[PDB]
Design a protein around this ligand. Sequence first.
Ligand SMILES: Nc1ncnc2c1ncn2[C@@H]1O[C@H](COP(=O)(O)OP(=O)(O)O)[C@@H](O)[C@H]1O
Ligand SMILES: Nc1ncnc2c1ncn2[C@@H]1O[C@H](COP(=O)(O)OP(=O)(O)O)[C@@H](O)[C@H]1O
Ligand SMILES: Cc1ncc(CO)c(CN)c1O
Ligand SMILES: Cc1ncc(CO)c(CN)c1O
Ligand SMILES: [Ca+2]
Ligand SMILES: [Ca+2]
Ligand SMILES: [Ca+2]
Ligand SMILES: [Ca+2]
Ligand SMILES: [Ca+2]
Ligand SMILES: [Ca+2]
Ligand SMILES: [Ca+2]
Ligand SMILES: [Ca+2]
Ligand SMILES: [Cl-]
Lengths: 287, 295
Amino acid sequence: DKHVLSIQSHVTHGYVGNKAATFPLQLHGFDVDAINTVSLSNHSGYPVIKGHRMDLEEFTTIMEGLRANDFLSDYAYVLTGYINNRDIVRQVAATVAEIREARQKQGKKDAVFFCDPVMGDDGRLYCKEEVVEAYRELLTHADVATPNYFEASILSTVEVKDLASAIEAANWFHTQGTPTVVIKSFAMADDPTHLRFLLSCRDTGSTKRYTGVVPYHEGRYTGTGDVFAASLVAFAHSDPMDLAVGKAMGVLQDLIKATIERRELRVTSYPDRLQHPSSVALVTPLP
Amino acid sequence: DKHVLSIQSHVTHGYVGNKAATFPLQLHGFDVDAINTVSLSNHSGYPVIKGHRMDLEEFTTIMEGLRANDFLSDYAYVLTGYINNRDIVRQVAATVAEIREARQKQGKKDAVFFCDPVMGDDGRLYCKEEVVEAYRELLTHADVATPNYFEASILSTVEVKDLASAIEAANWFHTQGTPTVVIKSFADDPTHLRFLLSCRDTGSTKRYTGVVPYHEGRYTGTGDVFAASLVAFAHSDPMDLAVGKAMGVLQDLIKATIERGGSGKATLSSRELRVTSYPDRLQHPSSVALVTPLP
Ligand SMILES: Nc1ncnc2c1ncn2[C@@H]1O[C@H](COP(=O)(O)OP(=O)(O)O)[C@@H](O)[C@H]1O
Ligand SMILES: Nc1ncnc2c1ncn2[C@@H]1O[C@H](COP(=O)(O)OP(=O)(O)O)[C@@H](O)[C@H]1O
Ligand SMILES: Cc1ncc(CO)c(CN)c1O
Ligand SMILES: Cc1ncc(CO)c(CN)c1O
Ligand SMILES: [Ca+2]
Ligand SMILES: [Ca+2]
Ligand SMILES: [Ca+2]
Ligand SMILES: [Ca+2]
Ligand SMILES: [Ca+2]
Ligand SMILES: [Ca+2]
Ligand SMILES: [Ca+2]
Ligand SMILES: [Ca+2]
Ligand SMILES: [Cl-]
């Protein structure tokens, strides 16, 4: 039951996408079955990016092999990240539905679909508007979504700038049909040394909300969301979602503080820290 | 020092090529830069295999990204496995030469190129015939080669059936220009497999042999974890101890695969190597096979 289908980027150099997600999940005892939506030399922040991008036919070809060999019922978890292709984003919906059906037929626990709606960061979109709408549709089928504040803002049309606006953005995701939302971080004008996160859990129609903070470290980091979502899948397998978010945040804080001592996360260097973070973030219920 | 360029297959399901090699190398503290020569649903052993295969242009496109960002001097190790493309196999010699020149321009020690000539197993080619000769041409530029006994047999044209025949096959590799050869396993005594390590400086050859328990059944990915383990141990062990430790890793891995229900009669899925099951045993195997000098 620790089997994840991970639909994300591959880079030869550096740690984003399946390069950020695979080692942490393997360390936690998961089999990671990766579909590499792109196979590039490196992440999009280097001066030169080269390599291959999947089209829809390449994705449905891989699916045909997974289907033919009866692997689809293996996937207790689906984790989607960088896709940046309208046709493949839409196709994930059918892929998740076919996995749900194969698992239901075999009497296994429902799959948990973690959707990381990877679109941009730091005010910059890296996809066409058609990808934004495709994620709005796919999120009608997600169990968990892990947007950064920029993605939560563009999907909901709420500027996420504080806890109130994070909650309005999260409430949009619930209405869309995602029961569990993590807005991974936002800056606060009124609290400049912290980043705040929100965990919002819709049932009753009732919503349990949790918040907390991490230190706002100087500098910019790549692959933070990708290690975060992978770590969240790992912890959420055995922990309630609030404690799973706390551990995942602690993993990210150990990795960032290591990088400052010691932009690229050295995901490989602190294997102990990926499993047992030096501290957990408090994840406290809101009234 | 601990940076590997690994040119091998990617599979979604199961544990061969880059998926099999990457986790062990990461646990040993290496950055693995993977070029995925194919992106397939699963290994060639299953009834159905689907997905994308690199052509030479896709390979040179990735190399341009690595060149333009000045990453080539980082590669202290080059490891090749599944390519199954005559043009890309041919292009690896130019890639390695370019890395050696980038490294010297930065005052770095020379790279070590580990060439796993991935072509076939159990007496059957699963590569195009064209690829066999391309491996003969690449092996003259390899520092270390890790053929299975079938690959050693088809490259040298010696039937590797026993220690003497493995030695004749290894001598062919050395004459071809490969200084260090590991024939990973061959055939009394039904309950063991024997291996050969052969090191040509000198003009002299130091040979070693050893055995591992033979386990009933066909495993896939065993060569791929072995070559990755060998790169990892050879970074801080003499080659004979590195072979001993890599054999030990494989014995633990095969025993964990059997114990989780992957016996000789179990499904292909059940026999997939349990690469993630015992990460400590990937670094520190429960046994180290003896690698004893031949006279
Ligand atoms: N500058 C920062 N200081 C502290 N923690 C950070 C910082 N940037 C990222 N993080 C951590 O990484 C996690 C994910 O990063 P975030 O920027 O929210 O997502 P993404 O990488 O997708 O944009 C956050 O929840 C937080 O734990
Ligand atoms: N059936 C087996 N029993 C025991 N060890 C095995 C078995 N198959 C493979 N191994 C181990 O895996 C290593 C590599 O496997 P081998 O079959 O020689 O290469 P390949 O997987 O490339 O064909 C061997 O050196 C040995 O240690
Ligand atoms: C290919 C790829 N995947 C994922 C991410 C996000 O962490 C980026 C952006 N660095 C990227 O370029
Ligand atoms: C795609 C691929 N890579 C590597 C290997 C070697 O173990 C095989 C054959 N199982 C294969 O099919
Ligand atoms: Ca961010
Ligand atoms: Ca960032
Ligand atoms: Ca992200
Ligand atoms: Ca074999
Ligand atoms: Ca020739
Ligand atoms: Ca030579
Ligand atoms: Ca085999
Ligand atoms: Ca092999
Ligand atoms: Cl706030």
